[PDB]
Amino acid sequence: IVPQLQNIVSTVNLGCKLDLKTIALRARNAEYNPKRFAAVIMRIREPRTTALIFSSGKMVCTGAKSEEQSRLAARKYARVVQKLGFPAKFLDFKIQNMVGSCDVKFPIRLEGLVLTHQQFSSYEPELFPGLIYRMIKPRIVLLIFVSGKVVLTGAKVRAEIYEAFENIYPILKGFRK
Amino acid sequence: SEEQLNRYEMYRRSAFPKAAIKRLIQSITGTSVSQNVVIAMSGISKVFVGEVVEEALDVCEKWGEMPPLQPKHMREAVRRLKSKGQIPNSKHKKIIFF
Amino acid sequence: RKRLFSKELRCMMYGFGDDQNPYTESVDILEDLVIEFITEMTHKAMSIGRQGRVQVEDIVFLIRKDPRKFARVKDLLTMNEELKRAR
């Protein structure tokens, strides 16, 4: 089994202060709702990706499914800000989070899993139909469902997701229904 | 064992549905409630059911009967809980000084 | 009135040691008790605190005396906040 990435959240400093009204009026697919939130929400189409551009020149880029695709979408957002007229430098690009999900191909019985690992797992069925297991060494949060689908979140690199899944796989096989 | 693991599964996974209690409370208030009210009110009522069944199985163990719960152990459960003030009735103006 | 808690309450009685197959009359008594408890709590909550509004704060003051119920409300609220933070 391999976990495929579903969501990459990155951040990039453009270095130049922006007034948001000209970007909202000139650029396409740009949404600005200040009485609601203080950023410009611009979406692109080729890589299905969304950017929140802030007035201090920092940009949050969400939605891509690899590191190179997130970097390429961030470059596209920087050049569409640039060609409007602002002098925009690609100062620092950092990926805040990487999210992956996988299916372990059997039903899982969660009550023994909270019974034997109650130090790291918080499970409340009514609030959410999933078990939050916190891995202490990778620093990942895993939502483990009864149907067999596991969602790994809270990672910076890919190898952390891979090592967390290889860590939590023998426990899940030990607790098969 | 193999029944204790099934019983512990039903002790945790069972809940009253939030789509009906939000319909039930709003028929008493008149206008609207919030999600953090319905989350708490669905949780207290599970403790209150667990206050009765854990005490109605004390009535059945006191008398000479088995685990199936007849209503005799359930009217007696509300009687013993009310004498310890656990069951609140806001229609009986009580008076302690006589 | 119909029964809005017929199948849900049978899982809960099994959760506290009754049987896998309880009696319909016992399930009916439990459902009536739950509806009465919810109604009483809602009236007292409307009286206490903001008149005509039932809030979490009012519900918490009402359940303060009973230890088992107060602990459950606090745990559920804290866990809800934690799950929202994780999301």
Partner: peptide
């Protein structure tokens, strides 16, 4: 989408195991 379909699977097994036959009492 994962939260929407998995919520009803905690309750679907709560209608297959418990309460198979319906009883009554005098």
């Amino acid at each position: 989408v994962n939260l929407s379909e998995e919520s009803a699977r905690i309750l679907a097994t709560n209608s297959e195991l418990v309460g198979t036959l319906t009883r009554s009492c005098k």
